[PDB]
Amino acid sequence: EANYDFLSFMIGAAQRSHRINRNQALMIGKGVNEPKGWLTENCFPVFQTLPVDVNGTSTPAFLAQDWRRFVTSFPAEYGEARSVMHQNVFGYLAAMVDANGRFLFGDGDLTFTPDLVRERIRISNCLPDPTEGNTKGGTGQDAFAAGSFVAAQAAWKTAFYAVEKRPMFFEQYEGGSSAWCVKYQFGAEDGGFVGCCEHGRILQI
Amino acid sequence: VDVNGTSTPAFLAQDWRRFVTSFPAEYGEARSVMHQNVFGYLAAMVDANGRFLFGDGDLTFTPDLVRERIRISNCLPDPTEGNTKGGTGQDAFAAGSFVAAQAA
């Protein structure tokens, strides 16, 4: 009697759950029956940044001086390597101010938006996002809570592999359908694993 | 901002940039609406030494708005109380006011 189609809605409602579960697991997957993500693997050498002084307090911080130091410290012979970060970090970067009042990037055009693909920064939104909900820039009780992920950088075409065997399938389950409840079944097979985890580094507060 | 230990409300260009770039890009492209006095307020800001933050010496800052997604409508509320309010050392800027919006 529906004035719609549950099925084609649900079929879409499962693939959306697969795509987001796969990508997330491939990042933070924990060992057994989930590919070990490179975050929890914790064999990427991790670089942590210094704290700053303010009115005697030793708040932790993250200055533009760090970002350039981090990106450039990649060994040249490993190859070209992109970077990954939650866009709230990139928003935190573009909005920095020098001593007097000028912006560091994009001096005087209301917005700083360079072509990412030329600065080798692929951007995402389900990374740990250090600036909690864009509310933890930091001068008092807004310090970054030292020990948070900020960005990562790696020669990805050799630092991590993602394997694929079969895309999703949907099969009616005759049996279990008790003449009230039509019951569908879906699944897929895939995996991933970390290759040489020397190509690749992690920044932290 | 603590103007000689007083903490008047304020709104400076650093806030406008951080507000517009925070919009999660997976929602699409978004336009910003605001009262024309606000856009005048941004255009007249000054750095500590006296220069202008926008158009470092032109007598005028007139950028392509449709290339910045700002869509002025002098029909929204403006925090400058028409004019002659907001942007002070002291005795102005109504805490709690409206400034601008942004959405798909």
């Binding site: 210094l50 200055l63 909005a95 101010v97 001593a99 909900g133 864009n134 930091g138 001068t139 | 806030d15």
Partner: peptide, 20 residues
Amino acid sequence: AAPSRLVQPGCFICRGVAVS
């Protein structure tokens, strides 16, 4: 949604010389 703050970075410059 409750009004969230928008804390942005202050004047951050230095990491090696404290002021007298």
